[PDB]
Design a protein around this ligand. Structure first.
Ligand code: HEM
Ligand SMILES: OC(Cn1cncn1)(Cn1cncn1)c1ccc(F)cc1F
Length: 526
């Protein structure tokens, strides 16, 4: 064996004297071979979930997961069951499908998994430092608490007429509508809904000043920042191109604008209860006494607005698209509007929104069919034993949960690919905890996360924008319904989702044709 060891050194030597044709080829095919051999040895382990076979090292199943994750999950489920792993751009993802998966991932102990470790590079380059994913979990919990303080019933009461006003103003002024001059038109909903969403959300959450900013070239900065919000950040968060420079500069200029308003308000003591900015100026002190800086407040505002932007705009787009081939549902919704608002003589309020179950069921059904986040990740921090299995998920892995997948399973939602708002009759709430509850720092929420329907997630990372989303989408759809009818161009139908973008927005261009219900109706104001 001493003689064997000599030939090892000889072999190492002879390698380095190989022609580069053969040892680019060498250093290529020997990972390819080792990978296959490694998977074969891996598949024999009884303490690991089955691993989806893949040919290309590092890359893994990235391409099929990236383009059609649900079809990917369905195939893996048929073959392997509800628990399985797959390689994705250098990381091993352990998927757990179904309610048991919801429970395993969303209710995982703080010591076991980390969301911020999974998402920091996705969001921090976009929002700025010190907030959301660029901070400890208990900091995040309180930031969520701070923001929730601006999201009260009384706040929604004041938001509704503000949001309504922005919708009507958009109908009046936008080149996409111009209702005082046009009775019919064609629109790309991936153009109109992001614009309507930023106008309505800015006006209510940021306030008059920041909304006024959107009527200038300052609006261009929001687009630049929006482009940095991309899956590519998972691999290339910072790359010396101008996509990144436009992003970084936008983040600085936008937070600078918020900070200017913040410092301005404090200078003049002008701090009431107008908006989320007022709210955070009065309520952003952590439990240990440390106060958020003006930069961190601005950075939080960016993240919250940006996140709400994408989820809400995608959702109202899908609502329009599903209703476009369903004049029956438009008809039902309109009748509800006529009854609840007394033929339109009653002004829309937050309370009246609560008396519109079909409208809210329509939102609920859209979120079932189109969960804007098709996958949620956590990085595994401590080895996790999978209950009632021999499986152990080692630290360094990632767990993946997908409530959106379950939303589309017939076993939980019969005829899951049919849009049917009536499957939610006497269950028109946005969601509802109906068992024991728990507080992670931002308010009591559902302890159990086993519901097959989880558009807003669960556990410590649960959404806090749920009621704002329903308020915003509710006011907007209420006005769309009362003002317009709409349908598809001949031969067109609901498009497939684009699963490669940050949220599962519709494939473009997604066009609908609108017409005024009352051609002679005029929208007043300047
Ligand atoms: C239809 C609209 C929306 C949907 C479907 C949605 C969905 C979700 C989901 C599934 C999560 C859980 C994330 C995870 O577990 O990793 C989440 C978290 C969160 N969302 Fe939303 N969201 C929506 C709108 C909004 C809005 C409008 C806001 C703010 C006004 C918002 C702010 C947040 C915040 C602060 C978190 C917590 C992040 C964390 O704790 O890690 N969302 N959202
Ligand atoms: O959870 C997100 C980040 N994200 C995860 N997968 C894709 N994007 C999205 N989001 C959820 N509700 C709204 N946006 C988020 C969470 C909080 C936040 F402040 C911004 C933000 F983008």
């Amino acid at each position: 064996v001493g003689e064997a060891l000599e030939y090892v050194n000889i072999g190492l030597s002879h390698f380095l004297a190989l022609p580069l044709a053969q040892r680019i080829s060498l250093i290529i095919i020997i990972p390819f071979i080792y990978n296959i051999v490694w998977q074969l040895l891996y598949s024999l382990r009884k303490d690991r979930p089955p691993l989806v076979f893949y040919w290309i090292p590092w890359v893994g199943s990235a391409v099929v997961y990236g383009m059609k994750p649900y079809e990917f999950f369905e195939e893996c489920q048929k073959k392997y069951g509800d628990i399985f792993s797959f390689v994705l751009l250098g990381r091993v993802m352990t998927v757990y499908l179904g309610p048991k998966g919801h429970e395993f991932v969303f209710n995982a102990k703080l010591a076991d998994v980390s969301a911020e470790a999974a998402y920091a590079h996705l969001t921090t380059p976009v929002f700025g430092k010190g907030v959301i994913h660029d901070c400890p979990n208990s900091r995040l919990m309180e930031q969520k608490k701070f923001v929730k303080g601006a999201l009260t019933k009384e706040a929604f009461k004041s938001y509704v007429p503000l949001i309504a006003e922005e919708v009507y103003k958009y109908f009046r002024d936008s080149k996409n509508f111009r209702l005082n001059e046009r009775t019919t038109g064609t629109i790309d909903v991936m153009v109109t809904q992001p614009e309507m969403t930023i106008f309505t959300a800015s006006r209510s959450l940021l306030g008059k000043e920041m909304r006024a900013k959107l009527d200038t070239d300052f609006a261009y900065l929001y687009s630049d920042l929006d482009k940095g919000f991309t899956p590519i950040n998972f691999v290339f968060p910072n790359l010396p191109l101008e996509h990144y420079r436009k992003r970084d500069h936008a983040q600085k200029a936008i937070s600078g604008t918020y900070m200017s308003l913040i410092k301005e308000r404090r200078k003049n003591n002008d701090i009431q209860d107008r908006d989320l900015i007022d709210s955070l100026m009065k309520n952003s002190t952590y439990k240990d006494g440390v106060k958020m800086t003006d930069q961190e407040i601005a950075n939080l505002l960016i993240g919250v607005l940006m996140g709400g932007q994408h989820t809400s705009a995608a959702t109202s787009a899908w609502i329009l698209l599903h209703l476009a081939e369903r004049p029956d549902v438009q008809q039902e919704l309109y009748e509800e509007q006529m009854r609840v608002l007394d033929g339109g003589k009653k002004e829309l309020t937050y309370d009246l929104l609560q008396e519109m179950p079909l409208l809210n069921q329509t939102i609920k059904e859209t979120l079932r069919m189109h969960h804007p986040l098709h996958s949620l990740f956590r990085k595994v921090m401590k080895d996790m034993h999978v209950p009632n299995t021999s499986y152990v998920i080692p630290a360094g892995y990632h767990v993946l949960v997908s409530p959106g997948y379950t939303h589309l399973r017939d076993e939980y939602f019969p005829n899951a690919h049919q849009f049917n708002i009536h499957r939610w009759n006497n269950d028109s709430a946005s969601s509802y905890s109906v068992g024991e509850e728990v507080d992670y720092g931002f308010g009591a929420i559902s302890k159990g996360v086993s519901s097959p329907y989880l558009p807003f997630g669960g556990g410590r990372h649960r959404c806090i924008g749920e009621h704002f989303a329903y308020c915003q989408l509710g006011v907007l759809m209420s006005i769309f319904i009362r003002t317009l009818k709409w349908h598809y161009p001949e031969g067109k139908t609901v498009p497939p989702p684009d699963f490669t973008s940050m949220v599962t927005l519709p494939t473009g261009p997604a066009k609908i044709i609108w017409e005024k219900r009352n051609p002679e109706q005029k929208i007043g104001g300047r």
